[PDB]
Design a protein around this ligand. Structure first.
Ligand code: QUI
Ligand code: QUI
Ligand code: QUI
Ligand code: QUI
Ligand code: MG
Ligand code: MG
Lengths: 8, 8
DNA sequence: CGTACG
DNA sequence: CGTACG
């Protein structure tokens, strides 16, 4: 759920 | 994440 | 690095 | 009730 590189 | 009634 | 429902 | 990444 975080999007630091993927945002899912 | 489960969709038993919303599916999110 | 943790968000997302009826 | 539990899922979703590079
Ligand atoms: C977001 O909160 C989140 C949490 N755990 C994960 C595991 C696998 C891929 C994506 C994820 N996203
Ligand atoms: C994004 O592409 C990405 C990849 N690996 C990580 C590891 C831990 C924290 C955040 C990350 N973000
Ligand atoms: C799915 O796995 C999941 C987990 N917890 C939640 C909390 C709030 C809304 C949606 C949710 N979805
Ligand atoms: C779906 O609409 C819905 C509503 N509340 C719940 C509570 C517990 C398990 C599954 C649920 N599904
Ligand atoms: Mg985890
Ligand atoms: Mg929970």
């Amino acid at each position: 759920x975080a999007x630091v590189x993927a945002x899912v």
